[model samples]
Target: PVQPILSSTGVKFQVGDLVWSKVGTYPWWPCMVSSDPQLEVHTKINTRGAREYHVQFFSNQPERAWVHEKRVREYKGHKQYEELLAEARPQRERAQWDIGIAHAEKALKMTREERIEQYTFIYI
Candidate 1:
């Protein structure tokens, strides 16, 4: 049987609300929320709907970039906290990461029946 899609919130952001964007080598800069940078799935780019945040930096310069959800948050939480992600700019790729993505993308090519059989082989 196919799995049902969860109704929980995965993507949430208002164009008018403010967000704290922590891009690489940069601190958590507050930005007015925007999203003209969301990734579009296509024949080659199989992103599976990776959401992006288009932030207009509070700074007075012409600075704006497409950041992933891992680098963004509500402006109210600007007091600093735990951290994650270099998913913004693809640099210094990890060995395990490269292989992991390859496995996942190739697995996407097969049907669930193939997955079930593969799993069953590991069982009885």
Candidate 2:
């Protein structure tokens, strides 16, 4: 359903437009529309169609890349960028969020343990 708006030179974007491009499976990156729109791919894809809008990523190598109509979207602002950056890492440590130091505090915070009488043991 994310088809490119194409009818009578109808491109949803224009040259120099600031946008976000989701290249591959990686997160979206800030980029700009570096060239005039090309209608080279409007008619042949089976799903998630393409509009051939050439985009350039800032300070990134091999800057130019074309994206599917659904892949690229309008750039909102720094607030949106802030959200993107924050969501990028679920746990920055990746391997472990806790180790021995976290356990150090747990000892003082926990309650004391005791055994019940042998005949009337309690179950929790």
Candidate 3:
């Protein structure tokens, strides 16, 4: 069975509402909510209709893709998702620095014999 769709608020989405489209594993991409009110058969379930939206992304290749209501989430202004993405980017860069430091520290603490072994493995 599929999970039911729920809106963040009890409001109906209209045109010109900034939103995010769940494209993949990464965080939702910014998109403009440009769909009109409608119903669609999202699945092959023996049931009623499903709410759907047509979104146009602000991406390099601008196009419209029909998405289920659940796949889209309303984006309040003030760069909500943008700030989240920005914050996450630094964390990822910091993690890479941490990994590099760990490798450097391990090599610095190695004895001459251990260092030879490390270089030997690299050469192999």
Candidate 4:
């Protein structure tokens, strides 16, 4: 059995709540609270007592990990991964098209010597 400790903002997060974990000096990353918060006592003299919560990142690579309560908070005012992907679809398509156009333009202006070098390079 474990007791829940409220965060710095006085937020008591429940399992399945969307949250952001502060990754050092980097941006806050979105994650899901996977377990109830608990107080952990470290043996190291340099380490202080803190509440730790098991969390799962959206990436699912680590799948789950523990983070300090102060490092995590409710995620808000940020786009979900699906929405970011959807918004980038057209931009990605445009970049691909631009690359194809540049390739075609280069081929059109290629000298006979350049074409020979190109094919030799590709066939070898």
- Each prediction's RMSD over C-alphas, in Å, is 19.8, 23.3, 20.1, 20.5
Candidate 3 per-residue lDDT over residues 50-91, each given as its tens digit? 666666554433435666667677654424556655755466
Cα lDDT for residue 42, candidate 4: 16
Which lDDT tens digits does candidate 4 get at residues 20-110?
6654443455565553224332111215655666665544134345677767666542544344335433565445434433433453365
lDDT of 2 by residue, 34-64 (tens): 5423542322242444455666654313345
Deviation from native of the Cα of residue 96 in model 1, angstroms: 38
Candidate 4's C-alpha lDDT?
0.47
- Provide TM-scores for the models: 0.45, 0.45, 0.41, 0.40
**Clashing residue pairs for model 1:** none
Q: If both were scored by lDDT, which would come out higher, candidate 2 or candidate 3?
A: 3
Clashes of each: 0, 0, 0, 0
Alpha carbon lDDT of each predicted model = 0.48, 0.47, 0.48, 0.47
Task: Give candidate 1's total backbone clashes.
Answer: 0
lDDT of 1 at 86: 34
Which stretches of candidate 1 lie above 4 Å from their native place?
A: 1-9, 35-48, 77-124
Residue 54 error for model 3, in Å? Answer: 0.5
- For model 1, the local distance difference test gives 0.48
Please give the TM-score that candidate 2 achieves against the real structure: 0.45
Q: Which structure is stronger by TM-score: 1 or 3?
A: 1
Clash number for candidate 3: 0
